[PDB]
Design an enzyme around this catalytic site. Structure first.
Site, PDB file in Angstrom:
ATOM      1  N   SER A   1      19.856 -25.634  88.041  1.00  0.00           N
ATOM      2  CA  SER A   1      18.728 -24.701  88.223  1.00  0.00           C
ATOM      3  C   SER A   1      17.875 -24.973  89.432  1.00  0.00           C
ATOM      4  O   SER A   1      17.480 -24.047  90.109  1.00  0.00           O
ATOM      5  CB  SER A   1      17.808 -24.698  86.992  1.00  0.00           C
ATOM      6  OG  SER A   1      18.403 -23.868  86.016  1.00  0.00           O
TER       7      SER A   1
ATOM      8  N   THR B   1      11.237 -25.861  78.936  1.00  0.00           N
ATOM      9  CA  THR B   1      12.404 -26.103  78.047  1.00  0.00           C
ATOM     10  C   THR B   1      11.969 -26.916  76.812  1.00  0.00           C
ATOM     11  O   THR B   1      10.788 -26.912  76.433  1.00  0.00           O
ATOM     12  CB  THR B   1      13.544 -26.814  78.813  1.00  0.00           C
ATOM     13  OG1 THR B   1      14.788 -26.789  78.072  1.00  0.00           O
ATOM     14  CG2 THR B   1      13.146 -28.260  79.148  1.00  0.00           C
TER      15      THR B   1
ATOM     16  N   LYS C   1       8.992 -24.735  74.000  1.00  0.00           N
ATOM     17  CA  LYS C   1       9.084 -23.259  74.158  1.00  0.00           C
ATOM     18  C   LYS C   1       8.226 -22.480  73.172  1.00  0.00           C
ATOM     19  O   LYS C   1       7.763 -21.367  73.469  1.00  0.00           O
ATOM     20  CB  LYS C   1      10.563 -22.772  74.136  1.00  0.00           C
ATOM     21  CG  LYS C   1      11.303 -23.142  75.401  1.00  0.00           C
ATOM     22  CD  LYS C   1      12.478 -22.149  75.751  1.00  0.00           C
ATOM     23  CE  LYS C   1      13.663 -22.354  74.862  1.00  0.00           C
ATOM     24  NZ  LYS C   1      13.606 -23.764  74.286  1.00  0.00           N
TER      25      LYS C   1
ATOM     26  N   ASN D   1      10.096 -19.202  77.808  1.00  0.00           N
ATOM     27  CA  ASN D   1      10.632 -20.212  78.752  1.00  0.00           C
ATOM     28  C   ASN D   1      10.089 -20.053  80.161  1.00  0.00           C
ATOM     29  O   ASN D   1      10.551 -20.753  81.041  1.00  0.00           O
ATOM     30  CB  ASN D   1      12.169 -20.166  78.846  1.00  0.00           C
ATOM     31  CG  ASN D   1      12.618 -18.976  79.623  1.00  0.00           C
ATOM     32  OD1 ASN D   1      11.888 -18.006  79.681  1.00  0.00           O
ATOM     33  ND2 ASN D   1      13.795 -19.031  80.260  1.00  0.00           N
TER      34      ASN D   1
ATOM     35  N   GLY E   1      20.444 -22.966  67.491  1.00  0.00           N
ATOM     36  CA  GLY E   1      19.514 -23.432  68.515  1.00  0.00           C
ATOM     37  C   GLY E   1      19.877 -23.076  69.959  1.00  0.00           C
ATOM     38  O   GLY E   1      20.609 -22.114  70.253  1.00  0.00           O
ATOM     39  N   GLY E   2      19.374 -23.874  70.893  1.00  0.00           N
ATOM     40  CA  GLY E   2      19.430 -23.492  72.290  1.00  0.00           C
ATOM     41  C   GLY E   2      19.031 -22.027  72.418  1.00  0.00           C
ATOM     42  O   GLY E   2      17.979 -21.596  71.895  1.00  0.00           O
TER      43      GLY E   2
ATOM     44  N   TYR F   1      28.113 -23.459  81.355  1.00  0.00           N
ATOM     45  CA  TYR F   1      28.617 -23.105  82.720  1.00  0.00           C
ATOM     46  C   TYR F   1      29.181 -24.343  83.406  1.00  0.00           C
ATOM     47  O   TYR F   1      29.742 -24.278  84.503  1.00  0.00           O
ATOM     48  CB  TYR F   1      27.481 -22.543  83.638  1.00  0.00           C
ATOM     49  CG  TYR F   1      26.248 -23.431  83.688  1.00  0.00           C
ATOM     50  CD1 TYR F   1      26.186 -24.566  84.521  1.00  0.00           C
ATOM     51  CD2 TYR F   1      25.183 -23.173  82.862  1.00  0.00           C
ATOM     52  CE1 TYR F   1      25.039 -25.412  84.516  1.00  0.00           C
ATOM     53  CE2 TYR F   1      24.079 -23.975  82.845  1.00  0.00           C
ATOM     54  CZ  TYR F   1      24.005 -25.073  83.668  1.00  0.00           C
ATOM     55  OH  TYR F   1      22.871 -25.810  83.558  1.00  0.00           O
TER      56      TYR F   1
ATOM     57  N   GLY G   1      28.629 -19.362  81.366  1.00  0.00           N
ATOM     58  CA  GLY G   1      27.246 -18.909  81.441  1.00  0.00           C
ATOM     59  C   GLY G   1      26.609 -18.967  82.807  1.00  0.00           C
ATOM     60  O   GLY G   1      25.394 -18.944  82.891  1.00  0.00           O
TER      61      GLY G   1
END
Lengths: 272, 267
Positions: free
Chosen positions: A18, A63, A67, A88, A129-130, A213, A234
Site C-alpha cells: 500500500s 486498520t 476500524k 478504514n 473477519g478481515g 494479492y 485482490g
C-alpha cells in the site's frame, strides 16, 4: 511549503504494498506527500488522532484493531461506513475528522474490472473477519440471489450476521453456487500453502475471488484455474482502495488509467 | 520504508527559510525526510510531543513560546542547554526526548566563520529577548572582557543598561538581538550610526534583509558587519547532526549558505 503527511494507523504494522502504491499515486497526480505506517498502542488512539488533526495530517487509513474503535473520534461517518460498521479511511478538515470505508469501493472496482457479476447470483463468502463486513454489504447492496457466510464458528458468527445464511465448512461441501470469495487469511503468509476449501469445492462455482494479492495465485486460486473457474486475486482492490482514499483526502478524481498503470507495476513487483 | 518526519514546533509560525535549509541538507547529505512547520497551541504541547515520540519523529526544533516550557517533558538536557535555560532542539530515542541548544552552536560557528573574536573584548548585546540567552551564555563561556545588555526599559548576571547609557560607550562587538530591522521594522535600527561606529564588529541575528540598516551603518563606518544567515544555516546543520548522529562537513553548510543568501536577496 509543508509536505502533506498521510499514512496508515494500526497497533502493529508489517511490510506493505500500500505505501508504495500511495507514493506512485502522489507522483501521478502531482501531490507532494509521504505515506507512512504509524504504529499506535491501544491506549493512545485518541491522543494520536488528536495530534494528527493538530499537525494537519493530509489523511489516514485505519486498520486492525481500530476500524470500529476509531469511530468514537469522528464527527461524521459516511452512510456506507455506518452500515458496514467499520471505518478504514479518515478525512481531516476544519470541523475535525470524518470517516469512510474504501474497502467497499475497492471490492466493487475489482468485480467490475474482471466482470464478476453479483446481481442475481449465488454468492459465497469464506470467513467472517478481515474485509468480510464490507464485501457482505456490497453483495447485498447489489442484489445477490443468495449470500452464504462460511465460518469455523457457526454459533458465534450467526449471532454476528443474523440476516445472512451462516454455515459450516462441512455444510459448504454440499452447496453449489456462482461466486465464492475468500476473506480468510489462508493462502497468504504465513499460511501460504493452505487453502480455505478443497478444489472440489472451488469446482462448483463459476468465479473464484481471493482478496489476497500476494501471492498472486493462492492455492485457492490455482484450484480455480485447474477447474475452469474464472480466478481473480485482490490486487485491483488494493490499488483501487488506495486511489479512492486519495480521492477523498485530496478531493480529486483519479483516472481509471492511473489505476491500471499502478496495477501493472505492482503486479510485476509482486511476482518478482 | 517510512520517511523520517522532522520539523519545527511553535504556536504561531510565519514561513521560514529554515524548511528549505533542512531540505537542502537532506539532499546534500542523503537523508530521506521532510521538515514541516508544526503549529501547536499551548494546551496541546504535552500531547503533541508525546505523539511525536510514538510515531518515532526524526527530531524537532522548538521555537517561541516553548523553548522554556518544553523542558518539562525531557528526560535528559545537555548541560549547555541547561545553563542557557532554553531548548531549541529535541532528540527522540526509545528512552524519550532529549533536549539541546543549537542556537548556541550556530552563533559560535558564525563568529568563527567571520573571525569575530570574543576573548577579552567588550561585548554589547542589544535586546534581552530573542536568542539573547544563548548569545549571552556564549560570550561568558568564551571569556568576554565585559558584557552589557541594553534594554528599552532596565526596570522591566551582566551589566544591564539603557540606550541612553549605551551612547556613552565604546566597545569591541555589538550584537543585535532585537526585532528592529526586520519586517515590519525594515526602516529602522535599534541604534544610531554614531553608536555602531564605536565598535569594531557589528553582528545582526537578523538575516532578512541580508543587510539591515544596522549593518549598513557598520559597513559605512568601517565596522565588520555580519548577518545571522550563517548562524541559521549552522544551527540547522547542528540539529541534523544531533538527530542523525552524523557529521556534516562545513562545505555543505557553506553551500546552503550561498543558496539562501541569493534567495533572500531576490525577494
Amino acid at each position: 511549503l509543508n509536505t502533506s503527511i498521510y499514512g496508515l494507523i494500526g497497533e502493529k504494522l508489517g511490510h506493505s504494498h500500500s505505501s508504495y502504491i500511495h507514493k506512485l499515486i502522489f507522483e501521478k497526480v502531482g501531490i507532494k506527500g509521504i505515506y507512512n505506517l504509524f504504529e499506535v498502542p491501544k491506549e493512545k488512539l485518541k491522543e494520536s488522532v488528536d495530534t494528527f488533526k493538530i499537525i494537519k495530517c493530509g489523511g489516514l487509513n485505519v486498520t486492525i484493531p481500530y476500524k470500529v474503535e476509531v469511530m468514537k473520534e469522528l464527527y461524521e461517518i459516511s452512510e456506507k461506513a455506518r452500515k458496514i460498521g467499520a471505518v478504514n479511511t479518515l478525512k481531516f478538515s476544519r470541523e475535525g475528522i470524518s470517516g469512510f470505508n474504501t474497502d467497499y469501493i475497492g471490492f466493487g472496482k475489482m468485480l467490475s474490472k474482471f466482470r464478476v457479476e453479483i446481481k442475481n447470483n449465488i454468492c459465497v463468502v469464506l470467513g467472517s473477519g478481515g474485509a468480510a463486513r464490507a464485501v457482505l454489504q456490497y453483495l447485498k447492496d447489489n442484489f445477490a440471489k443468495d449470500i452464504y457466510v462460511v465460518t469455523r464458528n457457526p454459533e458465534k458468527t450467526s449471532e454476528i450476521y443474523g440476516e445472512f445464511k451462516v454455515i459450516s465448512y462441512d455444510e459448504l461441501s454440499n452447496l453449489k453456487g456462482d461466486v465464492i470469495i475468500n476473506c480468510t487469511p489462508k493462502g497468504m503468509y504465513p499460511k501460504e500453502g493452505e487453502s480455505p476449501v478443497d478444489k472440489e469445492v472451488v469446482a462448483k462455482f463459476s468465479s473464484a475471488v481471493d482478496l489476497i494479492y500476494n501471492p498472486v495465485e493462492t492455492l485457492f486460486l490455482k484450484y480455480a484455474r485447474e477447474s475452469g473457474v474464472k480466478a481473480v486475486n485482490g490486487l485491483y482492490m488494493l490499488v483501487s482502495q488506495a486511489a479512492a482514499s486519495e480521492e477523498i483526502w485530496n478531493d480529486i478524481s483519479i483516472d481509471e488509467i492511473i489505476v491500471d498503470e499502478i496495477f501493472e507495476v505492482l503486479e510485476e513487483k509482486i511476482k518478482s
